[PDB]
């Protein structure tokens with residue numbers, strides 16, 4: 001069937017993830033490469049991963065890069081009547097999106113599911129019962145932000161010391177240090 005359920009996010013020390021429709025920090029090439037590799041790579045031959053994102057996250061991607069290449073793209077919105085141009089799936093909630101992954105059109109095409117933001121998308125996922133992993137890049141600086149990542153409940157999640165294919169040491173680009181973290185729960 002469909003593979004694992006995952007969130008991926010990059011978060012500043014003040015829990016910020018975005019600012020004026022953009023990232024709060026200047027672009028970090030390798031953080032982007034990690035995001036792309038993690039969400040694109042599929043363990044199952046012939047299948048692609050599904051990325052689920054909110055409407056504002058969709059429109060924050062430059063038009064030339066939509067939809068996200070090599071992945072099935074799904075947008076969450078209650079106001080849009082049809083998937084925006086370049087997208088082919090649109091759901092009213094994360095719960096609806098996950099139910100959509102068991103219909104034939106998605107079931108045998110989708111491996112892993114990756115929630116890629118923004119704030120209210122993460123929130124619905126981290127309430128969702130069941131097996132969930134959070135791939136969290138800790139950007140070790142404050143940045144002025146206007147949208148935030150919900151705090152992790154450490155009574156539900158375990159922080160894994162290492163995760164396969166993920167370096168656990170401090171990264172640094174453009175004067176900005178950060179670390180890749182992986183949390184897991186199984187409600």
Ligand SMILES: NC(=O)c1ccc[n+]([C@@H]2O[C@H](COP(=O)([O-])OP(=O)(O)OC[C@H]3O[C@@H](n4cnc5c(N)ncnc54)[C@H](OP(=O)(O)O)[C@@H]3O)[C@@H](O)[C@H]2O)c1
Nearest residue numbers: 009010018021022054055056057077078079117118119120
């Ligand atoms: N650092 C990171 O990892 C990261 C990741 C993603 C985005 N960002 C940045 O954060 C900002 C975009 O994120 P955002 O939080 O402001 O907006 P967003 O979550 O991407 O989009 C918000 C809209 O999407 C719909 N939506 C969101 N969650 C939903 C849910 N659970 N169920 C149904 N619909 C849902 C709603 O659309 P309707 O009003 O039409 O119903 C909502 O108004 C940008 O600045 C972006 O650059 C950062």
Ligand SMILES: CCc1nc(N)nc(N)c1OCCCCOc1ccccc1CCc1nnn[nH]1
Nearest residue numbers: 008009010027031032035060061065116117137
């Ligand atoms: C890399 C940031 C990030 N990192 C982690 N770990 N998780 C996330 N969910 C995450 O956000 C992804 C946001 C949706 C994909 O955004 C794309 C895709 C292609 C081109 C430009 C953008 C706009 C953001 C941007 N990235 N670099 N410059 N601009």
Ligand SMILES: [Cl-]
Nearest residue numbers: 035036068069
């Ligand atoms: Cl990408």
Ligand SMILES: [Cl-]
Nearest residue numbers: 040041042043
């Ligand atoms: Cl692949």
Ligand SMILES: [Cl-]
Nearest residue numbers: 150151152153
């Ligand atoms: Cl946290």
